[PDB]
Design an enzyme around this catalytic site. Structure first.
Site, PDB file in Angstrom:
ATOM      1  N   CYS B 111       1.501   4.022   3.341  1.00 31.76           N
ATOM      2  CA  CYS B 111       1.536   2.873   3.758  1.00 31.76           C
ATOM      3  C   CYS B 111       0.078   1.876   4.046  1.00 31.76           C
ATOM      4  O   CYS B 111      -1.294   2.220   4.176  1.00 31.76           O
ATOM      5  CB  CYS B 111       1.435   3.284   5.472  1.00 31.76           C
ATOM      6  SG  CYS B 111       0.924   2.597   7.449  1.00 31.76           S
ATOM      7  N   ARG B 114      -2.296   1.698   7.977  1.00 32.53           N
ATOM      8  CA  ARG B 114      -4.144   2.326   8.150  1.00 32.53           C
ATOM      9  C   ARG B 114      -4.487   2.073   8.644  1.00 32.53           C
ATOM     10  O   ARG B 114      -5.823   2.844   9.264  1.00 32.53           O
ATOM     11  CB  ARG B 114      -4.183   3.098   7.185  1.00 32.53           C
ATOM     12  CG  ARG B 114      -2.547   4.415   6.684  1.00 32.53           C
ATOM     13  CD  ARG B 114      -2.763   5.292   5.242  1.00 32.53           C
ATOM     14  NE  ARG B 114      -2.224   4.335   4.256  1.00 32.53           N
ATOM     15  CZ  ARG B 114      -3.103   4.480   2.932  1.00 32.53           C
ATOM     16  NH1 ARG B 114      -3.235   5.817   2.760  1.00 32.53           N
ATOM     17  NH2 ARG B 114      -2.922   4.073   2.219  1.00 32.53           N
ATOM     18  N   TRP B 283       4.133  -1.521  14.642  1.00 35.04           N
ATOM     19  CA  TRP B 283       4.208  -3.164  14.937  1.00 35.04           C
ATOM     20  C   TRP B 283       4.821  -3.558  13.431  1.00 35.04           C
ATOM     21  O   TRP B 283       4.069  -3.171  12.706  1.00 35.04           O
ATOM     22  CB  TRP B 283       3.259  -3.810  15.556  1.00 35.04           C
ATOM     23  CG  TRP B 283       2.061  -3.461  14.808  1.00 35.04           C
ATOM     24  CD1 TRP B 283       1.474  -4.505  13.511  1.00 35.04           C
ATOM     25  CD2 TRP B 283       1.123  -2.738  15.664  1.00 35.04           C
ATOM     26  NE1 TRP B 283       0.282  -4.037  13.982  1.00 35.04           N
ATOM     27  CE2 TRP B 283      -0.316  -3.029  14.510  1.00 35.04           C
ATOM     28  CE3 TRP B 283       0.414  -1.643  16.586  1.00 35.04           C
ATOM     29  CZ2 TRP B 283      -1.173  -2.443  15.398  1.00 35.04           C
ATOM     30  CZ3 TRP B 283      -0.573  -2.001  17.363  1.00 35.04           C
ATOM     31  CH2 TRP B 283      -1.704  -1.806  15.953  1.00 35.04           C
ATOM     32  N   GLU B 288       8.612  -7.358   6.107  1.00 34.28           N
ATOM     33  CA  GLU B 288       9.615  -6.560   6.433  1.00 34.28           C
ATOM     34  C   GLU B 288      10.673  -7.025   7.158  1.00 34.28           C
ATOM     35  O   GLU B 288      12.103  -6.481   6.473  1.00 34.28           O
ATOM     36  CB  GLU B 288       8.955  -5.308   7.457  1.00 34.28           C
ATOM     37  CG  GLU B 288       7.585  -4.602   6.936  1.00 34.28           C
ATOM     38  CD  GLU B 288       7.439  -3.151   7.936  1.00 34.28           C
ATOM     39  OE1 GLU B 288       8.411  -2.353   7.929  1.00 34.28           O
ATOM     40  OE2 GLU B 288       6.430  -3.894   8.500  1.00 34.28           O
TER      41      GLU B 288
HETATM   42  C1  HEM Z   1       0.104  -0.292  13.506  1.00 27.45           C
HETATM   43  C2  HEM Z   1       1.419  -0.741  12.582  1.00 27.45           C
HETATM   44  C3  HEM Z   1       2.170  -0.401  11.382  1.00 27.45           C
HETATM   45  C4  HEM Z   1       2.164  -1.564   9.911  1.00 27.45           C
HETATM   46  C5  HEM Z   1       1.488  -2.763   9.797  1.00 27.45           C
HETATM   47  C6  HEM Z   1       2.613  -0.474   8.870  1.00 27.45           C
HETATM   48  C7  HEM Z   1       3.219  -1.562   7.625  1.00 27.45           C
HETATM   49  C8  HEM Z   1       4.457  -0.376   7.463  1.00 27.45           C
HETATM   50  C9  HEM Z   1       4.748  -0.675   6.270  1.00 27.45           C
HETATM   51  C10 HEM Z   1       4.670  -2.505   5.573  1.00 27.45           C
HETATM   52  C11 HEM Z   1       5.856  -0.041   5.397  1.00 27.45           C
HETATM   53  C12 HEM Z   1       6.302  -0.701   4.101  1.00 27.45           C
HETATM   54  C13 HEM Z   1       7.357  -0.112   4.983  1.00 27.45           C
HETATM   55  C14 HEM Z   1       8.808  -0.035   4.159  1.00 27.45           C
HETATM   56  O1  HEM Z   1       8.762  -0.930   3.274  1.00 27.45           O
HETATM   57  O2  HEM Z   1       9.901   0.534   4.664  1.00 27.45           O
HETATM   58  C15 HEM Z   1       4.907   1.060   6.272  1.00 27.45           C
HETATM   59  C16 HEM Z   1       5.274   2.410   5.339  1.00 27.45           C
HETATM   60  C17 HEM Z   1       4.769   3.814   6.442  1.00 27.45           C
HETATM   61  N1  HEM Z   1       4.074   4.180   6.792  1.00 27.45           N
HETATM   62 FE1  HEM Z   1       3.004   2.605   8.409  1.00 27.45          FE
HETATM   63  N2  HEM Z   1       2.721   1.062   9.817  1.00 27.45           N
HETATM   64  C18 HEM Z   1       1.759   1.009  11.137  1.00 27.45           C
HETATM   65  C19 HEM Z   1       1.975   1.897  11.635  1.00 27.45           C
HETATM   66  C20 HEM Z   1       2.590   2.918  11.535  1.00 27.45           C
HETATM   67  C21 HEM Z   1       2.049   5.008  11.848  1.00 27.45           C
HETATM   68  C22 HEM Z   1       1.855   4.623  13.677  1.00 27.45           C
HETATM   69  C23 HEM Z   1       2.572   5.532  11.045  1.00 27.45           C
HETATM   70  C24 HEM Z   1       2.788   7.102  11.770  1.00 27.45           C
HETATM   71  C25 HEM Z   1       1.822   7.566  11.992  1.00 27.45           C
HETATM   72  C26 HEM Z   1       3.306   5.281   9.812  1.00 27.45           C
HETATM   73  C27 HEM Z   1       2.899   5.847   8.388  1.00 27.45           C
HETATM   74  C28 HEM Z   1       3.744   5.828   7.462  1.00 27.45           C
HETATM   75  C29 HEM Z   1       4.442   6.034   6.263  1.00 27.45           C
HETATM   76  C30 HEM Z   1       4.609   7.361   6.748  1.00 27.45           C
HETATM   77  C31 HEM Z   1       4.938   5.260   5.634  1.00 27.45           C
HETATM   78  C32 HEM Z   1       6.075   5.531   4.098  1.00 27.45           C
HETATM   79  C33 HEM Z   1       6.821   5.332   4.516  1.00 27.45           C
HETATM   80  C34 HEM Z   1       8.545   5.388   3.636  1.00 27.45           C
HETATM   81  O3  HEM Z   1       7.972   6.483   2.630  1.00 27.45           O
HETATM   82  O4  HEM Z   1       9.805   5.325   3.859  1.00 27.45           O
HETATM   83  N3  HEM Z   1       3.004   3.747   9.866  1.00 27.45           N
HETATM   84  N4  HEM Z   1       3.893   1.223   6.994  1.00 27.45           N
HETATM   85  C1  Q1T Z   2      13.522   1.153   2.946  1.00 25.64           C
HETATM   86  N1  Q1T Z   2      11.931  -0.192   2.692  1.00 25.64           N
HETATM   87  C2  Q1T Z   2      12.720  -1.241   2.873  1.00 25.64           C
HETATM   88  C3  Q1T Z   2      13.351  -0.828   4.325  1.00 25.64           C
HETATM   89  N2  Q1T Z   2      13.137  -1.152   5.863  1.00 25.64           N
HETATM   90  C4  Q1T Z   2      11.595  -2.435   5.233  1.00 25.64           C
HETATM   91  C5  Q1T Z   2      13.202  -0.350   6.622  1.00 25.64           C
HETATM   92  C6  Q1T Z   2      13.922   0.537   6.198  1.00 25.64           C
HETATM   93  C7  Q1T Z   2      13.324   1.325   8.130  1.00 25.64           C
HETATM   94  C8  Q1T Z   2      14.447   2.137   8.188  1.00 25.64           C
HETATM   95  N3  Q1T Z   2      15.341   3.163   7.928  1.00 25.64           N
HETATM   96  C9  Q1T Z   2      12.221   1.322   8.462  1.00 25.64           C
HETATM   97  C10 Q1T Z   2      11.446   0.809   7.983  1.00 25.64           C
HETATM   98  C11 Q1T Z   2      10.475   0.107   9.598  1.00 25.64           C
HETATM   99  C12 Q1T Z   2       8.828   1.104   8.398  1.00 25.64           C
HETATM  100  C13 Q1T Z   2       7.943   0.947   8.991  1.00 25.64           C
HETATM  101  C14 Q1T Z   2       6.640   2.181  10.022  1.00 25.64           C
HETATM  102  C15 Q1T Z   2       6.181   1.738  11.130  1.00 25.64           C
HETATM  103  C16 Q1T Z   2       5.391   2.630  11.857  1.00 25.64           C
HETATM  104  C17 Q1T Z   2       5.551   0.514  11.073  1.00 25.64           C
HETATM  105  C18 Q1T Z   2       6.233  -0.487  10.004  1.00 25.64           C
HETATM  106  N4  Q1T Z   2       5.422  -2.309  10.283  1.00 25.64           N
HETATM  107  N5  Q1T Z   2       6.998  -0.260   9.400  1.00 25.64           N
HETATM  108  C19 Q1T Z   2      11.881  -0.060   7.635  1.00 25.64           C
HETATM  109 CL    CL Z   3      -2.180  -4.183  11.736  1.00 27.51          CL
END
Ligand code: HEM
Ligand code: Q1T
Ligand code: CL
Ligand code: HEM
Ligand code: Q1T
Ligand code: H4B
Ligand code: H4B
Ligand code: CL
Ligand code: ZN
Lengths: 408, 413
Positions: B111, B114, B283, B288
């Site tokens: 993430c 963070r 958000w 994304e």
């Molecule tokens: C507040 C603004 C936030 C931003 C800008 C953000 C940004 C991101 C982005 C860009 C990714 C990659 C997502 C993807 O490519 O699928 C990600 C992954 C992730 N985020 Fe954050 N996030 C936010 C909030 C949070 C919150 C509130 C949580 C949990 C309490 C969180 C937990 C995670 C986790 C566990 C992943 C790994 C997802 C996966 O393995 O598919 N994020 N985040």
């Molecule tokens: C799996 N990675 C690429 C596809 N993407 C961008 C994608 C697929 C799913 C689902 N289901 C969900 C997300 C959101 C990930 C995420 C979570 C949070 C809390 C914030 C944020 N900015 N993005 C992203």
């Molecule tokens: Cl941010």
């Protein structure tokens, strides 16, 4: 075990068995991954390594366990016993050099691996000799724009006190200069090397693109300076197909990418001078060389001329300027008929290469962090390709910069 | 393990020193012989398994509130120990639940968002018993987090796993997502990523509008019962139509997206306890939507259509037409969200903030596990500062983990 890798876009799954053959370390452990870290003999050490290599060579020509194979092993051990080292046959040198390329996890260009011209320079004794061999390399590889991959291999390490080294990081590179006002003229990556050339008596023109001299060390002696004959240095003026003002930036680059500071390892032997060269992928120049903050750093200027709004990051002005720069580079090399590959075509070839390697070899070690291009990542097929990284030998390895080791 | 591992930034020359990796808890998947850093994914806990996991967490909690070794610490340990012995599990105090959730986020190596980790509203839904209850909790979450466009990060935590046959699960992978429909001719309408889940919804009795951006219903499982369908009240679903500041035609592509990114298929582990239903939301980072949702070949795949409207030469790859269109799409996304006053962050801003966060973590915490493969944005990688930052990846607990899709495991009643 058998390991599987999946392409998340095509769902194609491949099965890796090749990784079982690795013995070198990656840097990671069960508990910590160091995948994004850039940098993570004796008769007794020597023979097993020699054996392993000779074994794999004789296996690749389907004469494993033959009389020639048995004779060579004997020959090598006796030689290791009586001289504390050994010399590779010409066939072995060539096999080993092509395979160091084949095994290079960080290289997206490997589909070409078996087409490599190998220049044996192991009879070289002086810096003048090295200059001669390097000139001939550059002329061959340049080939009037139709670039050909090549490597020139100088004598192997003996005691470590008589190393052959090319001090330049690349055969062709531009100087960089510290200014009074503390800015940097030219290439900032080479300021230190440039300073060494100056102190050794190089007369700098102090321009933005001054081709550096070769600084060459033979048999552990102090290095000596040589000017590459300019007719051997192919260069491309960068222009844009639509923005006629782009040429006014005065940008150029060299056609030949030639890495000269790495170490080639084959069968326990260490070739500390092994300059190798191919042809460029456009982003190497147009993204890293031109647009890294710590390099030529030209985004701001290009964005100015494009009249972009540069007040907020969210206008993506940097991203826009970045694409145009890379369009120009490709267009310029293509117009001057100088071999270059774009990152879409290059990554597509790499996927095909990977599939070939899984099919004929049981795998392909690959470093995702290095293979994915520094722009537009996920619109290239490699972004979506799971890769396994492991170290196979023969290999190219990093080695210390010679100014941090050499006593004059 | 070496006590001190150093990471370098190749642009700034800044070197940082990690000691936090010594608290690493589980496997990365790598070994000394092979790295699996680009691999996407590399029966309950027994009494004896649970005891040390709980103690580890309780110690960490009391160490964080500067009461380590206190009478309260010793008494909590003793109460948790007795509970595990008489029930084979334990219940977290509200304070511990909140701390654990914030830290699972703090520890999420993939993430980039963070810097915000300590600002997370935690909704305790552990009293929930029915799918209807789950729906109520989720609606409240969506409304709170949406906040009329001024998004606020939040998580809603449903009851922990007990025997494994009574799991609470949100079958949706995101709280808000668009349906995908496979056509007889092999084309796909809507989002190809959600075809399987959409088909499941339809089979459960959902009547599909069969459009391109149909908000999917919630499919909610309580206490290991069969999942139940609910329609999210549309007024709770904030959407943004995508337009471009220069190209008047861009709006004629009919694109839009939802404002709230909310992940709902992950498992939250705290002190050895497993919360299989823990939807969380923040958000968006623009890429994304602009790069992945819109331009992946296997998603909406709009590059060609956009390129044609831009009248680019699409005959050679070397014209970089894809790259050119990609940037304009991402400009449109950011512009459309900012114009409608819906919180969004661009990839430059987000990565710069992440670097500052990481440096702070190294200094106050001794490290910051990060997955470079995931942290670096899917466009313009090397002109963001994270590209040049060496990172170390390891697993700290509390953590968010992947779990199997519930349709593969559910025992239909
Ligand atoms: C507040 C603004 C936030 C931003 C800008 C953000 C940004 C991101 C982005 C860009 C990714 C990659 C997502 C993807 O490519 O699928 C990600 C992954 C992730 N985020 Fe954050 N996030 C936010 C909030 C949070 C919150 C509130 C949580 C949990 C309490 C969180 C937990 C995670 C986790 C566990 C992943 C790994 C997802 C996966 O393995 O598919 N994020 N985040
Ligand atoms: C799996 N990675 C690429 C596809 N993407 C961008 C994608 C697929 C799913 C689902 N289901 C969900 C997300 C959101 C990930 C995420 C979570 C949070 C809390 C914030 C944020 N900015 N993005 C992203
Ligand atoms: Cl941010
Ligand atoms: C023929 C066309 C070739 C292309 C298009 C190509 C492409 C690339 C690219 C883009 C990189 C990453 C460079 C960087 O970011 O620093 C790379 C790295 C590398 N290449 Fe290739 N290459 C080619 C030929 C070769 C040849 C002939 C060799 C050796 C025989 C080779 C060996 C390597 C090695 C060892 C690396 C890793 C360098 C490092 O770790 O710094 N490549 N290549
Ligand atoms: C270290 N990577 C970023 C700087 N770049 C792009 C860079 C720096 C140096 C040096 N010195 C050298 C290169 C060339 C890498 C290379 C080697 C070969 C054989 C072919 C090719 N296309 N690129 C690339
Ligand atoms: C920190 C990171 O390892 C470093 O920036 C790497 C990332 N990936 C790279 N990839 C390529 N091709 N070349 C590089 O120089 C780098 N640098
Ligand atoms: C194969 C590779 O691991 C996969 O494509 C990863 C790469 N990095 C990513 N990074 C982010 N943020 N999101 C992703 O889905 C992925 N996918
Ligand atoms: Cl190529
Ligand atoms: Zn690893």
């Amino acid at each position: 075990r058998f390991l599987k890798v999946k392409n998340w876009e095509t769902e194609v799954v491949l099965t890796d068995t090749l990784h079982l053959k690795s013995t070198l370390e990656t840097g990671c452990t069960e508990y910590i991954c160091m995948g994004s870290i850039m940098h993570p003999a004796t008769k007794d050490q020597l023979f097993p390594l020699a054996k392993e290599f000779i074994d794999q060579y004789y296996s690749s020509i389907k004469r494993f366990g033959s009389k020639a194979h048995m004779e060579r092993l004997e020959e090598v051990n006796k030689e290791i016993d009586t001289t504390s080292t050994y010399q590779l046959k010409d066939t072995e040198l060539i096999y080993g050099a092509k395979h160091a390329w084949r095994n290079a996890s960080r290289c997206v260009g490997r589909i070409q691996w078996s087409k490599l011209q190998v220049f044996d320079a192991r009879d070289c004794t002086t810096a003048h000799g090295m200059f001669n061999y390097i000139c001939n390399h550059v002329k061959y590889a340049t080939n009037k724009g139709n670039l050909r991959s090549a490597i020139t291999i100088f004598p192997q390490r003996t005691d470590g006190k008589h190393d052959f080294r090319v001090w330049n990081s690349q055969l062709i590179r531009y100087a960089g200069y510290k200014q009074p006002d503390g800015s940097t003229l030219g290439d900032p990556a080479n300021v230190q090397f440039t300073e060494i050339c100056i102190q050794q008596g190089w007369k700098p023109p102090r321009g933005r693109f001054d081709v550096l001299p070769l600084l060459l060390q033979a048999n552990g002696n102090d290095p000596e300076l040589f000017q590459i004959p300019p007719e051997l240095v192919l260069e491309v003026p960068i222009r844009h197909p639509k923005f006629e003002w782009f040429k006014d930036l005065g940008l150029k680059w060299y056609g030949l990418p030639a890495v000269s500071n790495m170490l080639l390892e084959i069968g326990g032997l260490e070739f500390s001078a092994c300059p190798f060269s191919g042809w460029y992928m456009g982003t190497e120049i147009g993204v890293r060389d031109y647009c890294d903050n710590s390099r030529y750093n030209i985004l701001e200027e290009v964005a100015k001329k494009m009249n972009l709004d540069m007040r907020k990051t969210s206008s993506l002005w940097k991203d826009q300027a970045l694409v145009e720069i890379n369009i120009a580079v490709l267009y310029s090399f293509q117009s001057d008929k100088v071999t270059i590959v774009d990152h879409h075509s290059a990554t597509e070839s790499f996927i095909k290469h990977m599939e070939n390697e899984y099919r004929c070899r049981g795998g392909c070690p690959a470093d995702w962090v290095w293979i994915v291009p520094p722009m537009s990542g996920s619109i290239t097929p490699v972004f979506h390709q799971e890769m396994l990284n492991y170290r196979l030998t023969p290999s190219f390895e990093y080695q210390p910069d010679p100014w941090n080791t050499h006593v004059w």
